[PDB]
Amino acid sequence: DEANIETHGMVPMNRLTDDPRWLPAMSERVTRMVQRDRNHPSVIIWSLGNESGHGANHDALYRWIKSVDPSRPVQYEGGGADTTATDIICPMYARVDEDQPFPAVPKWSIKKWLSLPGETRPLILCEYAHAMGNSLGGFAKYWQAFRQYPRLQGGFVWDWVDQSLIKYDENGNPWSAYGGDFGDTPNDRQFCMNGLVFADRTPH
Amino acid sequence: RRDWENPGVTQLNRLAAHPPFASWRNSEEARTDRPSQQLRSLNGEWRFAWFPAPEAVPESWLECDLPEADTVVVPSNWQMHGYDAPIYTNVTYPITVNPPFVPTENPTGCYSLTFNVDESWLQEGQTRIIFDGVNSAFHLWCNGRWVGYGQDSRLPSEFDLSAFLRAGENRLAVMVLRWSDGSYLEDQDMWRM
Amino acid sequence: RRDWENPGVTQLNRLAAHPPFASWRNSEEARTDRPSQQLRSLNGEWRFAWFPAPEAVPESWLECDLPEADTVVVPSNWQMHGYDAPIYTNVTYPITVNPPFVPTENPTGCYSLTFNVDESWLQEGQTRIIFDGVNSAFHLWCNGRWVGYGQDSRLPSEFDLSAFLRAGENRLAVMVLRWSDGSYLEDQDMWRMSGIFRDVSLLHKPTTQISDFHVATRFNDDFSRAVLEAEVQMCGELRDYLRVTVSLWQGETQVASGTAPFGGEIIDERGGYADRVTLRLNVENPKLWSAEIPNLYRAVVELHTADGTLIEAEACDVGFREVRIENGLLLLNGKPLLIRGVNRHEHHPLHGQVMDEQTMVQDILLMKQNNFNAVRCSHYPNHPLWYTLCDRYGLYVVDEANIETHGMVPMNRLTDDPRWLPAMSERVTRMVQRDRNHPSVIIWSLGNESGHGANHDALYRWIKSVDPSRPVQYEGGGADTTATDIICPMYARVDEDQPFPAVPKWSIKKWLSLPGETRPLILCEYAHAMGNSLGGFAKYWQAFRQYPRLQGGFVWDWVDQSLIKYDENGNPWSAYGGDFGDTPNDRQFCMNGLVFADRTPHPALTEAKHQQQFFQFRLSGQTIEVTSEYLFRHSDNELLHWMVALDGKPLASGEVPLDVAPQGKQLIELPELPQPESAGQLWLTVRVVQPNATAWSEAGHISAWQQWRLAENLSVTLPAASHAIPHLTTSEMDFCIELGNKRWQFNRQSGFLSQMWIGDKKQLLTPLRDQFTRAPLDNDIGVSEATRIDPNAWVERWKAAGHYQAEAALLQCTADTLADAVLITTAHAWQHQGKTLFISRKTYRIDGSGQMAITVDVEVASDTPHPARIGLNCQLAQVAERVNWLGLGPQENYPDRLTAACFDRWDLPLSDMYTPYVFPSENGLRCGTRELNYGPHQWRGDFQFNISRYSQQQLMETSHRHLLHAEEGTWLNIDGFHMGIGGDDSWSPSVSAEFQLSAGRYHYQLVWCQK
Ligand SMILES: O=C1O[C@H](CO)[C@H](O)[C@H](O)[C@H]1O
Ligand SMILES: O=C1O[C@H](CO)[C@H](O)[C@H](O)[C@H]1O
Ligand SMILES: [Mg+2]
Ligand SMILES: [Mg+2]
Ligand SMILES: [Mg+2]
Ligand SMILES: [Mg+2]
Ligand SMILES: [Mg+2]
Ligand SMILES: [Mg+2]
Ligand code: NA
Ligand code: NA
């Protein structure tokens, strides 16, 4: 269960999340979620949000949750996926054997990430195997690693369904539309379609 | 105030968050998960009118249904009704980056509903309204009188209507803003509706 | 709306918090800390009008001054000018508890000011106004236009007036609310006042400016190398030509410097802070900061173009020091501290909560002169100058968020509520943003008496995250919760456990070793100094020195919160709770200091000075071992003075230079001393004297002392036979004895010495009789909340057992004629409702020398509560100018509070033998007395005494010191034994057992004679 906080377009990404003036607004998105959902057994892990860099408000909120509801781990990928604000190393798109050593927020090979000096947490990818169009190449590589490495405990594919929208042609025949198709601009075209299933639920 | 341009005001008069409730008055029904007569759905047909900005909303909308509004299903996203376009942006915010402000041209959906309640609710008890999801922020009025305001498009916003209810017909007016300071925290890679 | 009843709204249009700015436009002035033309004071005469609720304020006010307004000085607390009453309440909120609402009648202070602004300020840049402290909430308008709103009485609120001002004359209108939702977080135990009580200033900054800056210092392992890191952020016009230069100076010498363009390192996938830059300066062998030697450097932060144009400059004093807890110890610069602390409120008997430089300086001098090295900001951020002063003079400070919700039930009702998280967070976050660069602040505190809520854990974490250089502490919820890096209890005792449910106060020694516990322990409050108190102080200090993890504590507290009132005659007098019509109130509970409100010391101050000494001594024959407790400095301004005296008669003395390294020792061999064969006890006294004056002390200041008994020669000398023998005359009603010009009359019905004559003059106004009670001290009374009431308190136990009303029953009175004397023997029983509480048996032996030897043996029922004292009392007819005694002194001292007193021959004016505690009680006792001289009398034995013009009955029945009246003659209380005074807390019995008179049988002897 993930809080409704995403500040991706900021520069740098934690611009708001590291600022105390935004703590109150972020805080409600995290605490009201816990207050509402805490008795559901299916919820096993709380998430602080998505792509918001890593700011001190995150550390504050991680701690709030840990004190109020000790029954579930808290995770958060921002800022490097292994920050002080996450109980799980939860990268997005880290590769199996290949490192992607970006400055500040590298994406190590998942097998390698586990054994970095002093690291002991479980690793579960918050997002992996980007299913955009003809994709899923290399999927088996992940599964084989998950099986061999105890601490490699799986991940969440990105994503379940294409966000395509229906539009109608001259004749009233429906068609699958994407970014820009509504005159919307700027837009990111087909980037909203990344599912394992078409919008009507027919499988890819 | 332009409460929608102030990250320090994320709600006004909103009640506290809590797990799903039904106010069952019979233990066995609560046990079986059956319906509660104390919990009613207002989903269905509502009156709706679109405006280019909150400054364009006529004050009379508070007191009476606008002749130009249309009748639409709620819940709904307005773009799906063709009132305006849904926008598909990944990273780049759909509005100029200048926290906490938003554009002056800020599409506004005016929703309204005429309803009434069981006599016993006029009698005693607390009658609240629950909006499971309003995107991105909104002001609420009942029988022309202001009730409160709420942000966070993905959690319920509840207000106590007890003191506003009246006998016979009652009118809700909900002014929803497409953009608000809450949008700054709602940059997910998806259609912006 | 009513923003003042909505915790979700704590400000409107308020600017971000930041460290002290002045916007200098010349670097040398910034370096020198000279005044800045860009920072003006708006303090001074303002116009003011009081209203009973915000709704009574007329609209016109916004536009123009109200004819009936008054001109008053700002900053000020309006209660101090008489507009309404300050209220004195401890725990119970001054308003009805119903968050977040406040009463509809809510005193509103309308303040206004017409002032000028130079055209130049408006031609360019930004002009902001800064309100350092407004209690409790406020709206602000400029030239009739609404600017913004602010909450939190203890931190600055700043607003941009750039668009609101005009050349020349301008007018502010400030509407201040006494009560707001902010009041729910401002329940500290102090007077409840209101107004613009801190400075108001106007600051000009350039459009492209330094919007914040943080200074850090990290060290190598032995502190021989440091790296100063300063992160600077700007607002405005971001351009490639901009640069920041940070230069560090030691005196007029620049020791390091760095220049860089803006653009910090990459921090995430979206890049870095292009509006930030971090400069790193290497400093070799830095001079370190500590309370012992407050070495400072000056960091100057210039914002400029690369080609050389200074945009503006900000600056700060920098103290190189590291604070860390390791292996269970709080270390400063790698050495373990021993906190000699005190809690200090910002209180002035005339100005209320307004602080001024002189007062602060005065407090700091007195603190250091009395061996304090630390202060806790109970319970809110202080006036900004306080920090500058602590940085410069050298005191460790605990900076505390202005959050206290004591009156809630349970105490964490609000701190555990997420709806209150935003309001609490601003209190913590803006405090840290303003005060993070001050070296004096070594620990952050989350507030006080607010229970332990999840909001505390979140905020603890926030700070740990933005500022890893200082520990975070918080006592609420049991003192050792997950929200504190230090076990910081309030009033935990040294050896005695107080196992309250959920939040027990364990003995401090035991607390440290509870299973799994490893943190250091520093009391955030201890040794409650209310009235005649500080009993047991030494017990604490002994433990702190013996247990490494017991690293001290902050006494509660520095200064009594008494306010000045004026009588019909216009004479000033000290007032406390309820003295302004305020009610409910907690009476004198607001007075708990080591000093009176005008800074005159209470006697307990001297006990704290001694126990907090920085030199300890041991004696072994002819050798004195001095040990230094300083961690960083050598004893470079100190000499040891030693003196040996025989019962006060000086025999030999000398001085020897002290040269002891920090934590080191020095042995000092004393010369061959007297061997007088003449009777008496030899006493060695040594004092540490500072020969040179300092920033905080004068030449000759004494910083430490200690005494030891050397040899004693008991007297075996038989006094000569008298050429005389007293005669006895008896009648049914009296026994009268005569000897020369002397006579004593013993009443056969009462059984006491009823009159004595020397020559022809009567000596007594009241007979000499036993006394087993004292006018109860604040600690005997025990109250922390003014009807109620504790049956377990001392005072109630004695009252109920009948001690104050027991009547002497005569059991025997006989007279016998001796060879060279007359002897009177008496026995009396004190009873209460059929119960015999005490039995007093005595003998009075009058000899041909004119001496009267009185022997007394008392029995105390084992089942009655231990009595306050076992002694005699009488009202002497004579009123003498001076008191001369051979015993402990010179200041008042009690059994559990006499370590500081020294045995010598003392001589003081009568009035010095009375302590004017605001709330009167037994006072002025001096213990360990062997001879007492007053007027023509002399008393010898081994007793404790007090002497003054006020009877115990009077002290007991009067509530304020100004209402006392000297009685005729002099009251003298001479005790064989006197109970401890207590003080571990002032709201439960606190006198240690060893200081309780529980022996059952007591024996004392005195000789009364003339001189
Ligand atoms: O990093 C991400 O990758 C996905 C790309 O399709 C999508 O934007 C997810 O919301 C985001 O977390
Ligand atoms: O516990 C406490 O005791 C002191 C008693 O005077 C005073 O009330 C302090 O504010 C409080 O923290
Ligand atoms: Mg808002
Ligand atoms: Mg994204
Ligand atoms: Mg408020
Ligand atoms: Mg220069
Ligand atoms: Mg010009
Ligand atoms: Mg309190
Ligand atoms: Na695995
Ligand atoms: Na996508």
Ligand code: NA
């Ligand atoms: Na110690």
Ligand code: NA
């Ligand atoms: Na007090």
Ligand code: NA
């Ligand atoms: Na010396």
Ligand code: NA
């Ligand atoms: Na009294």
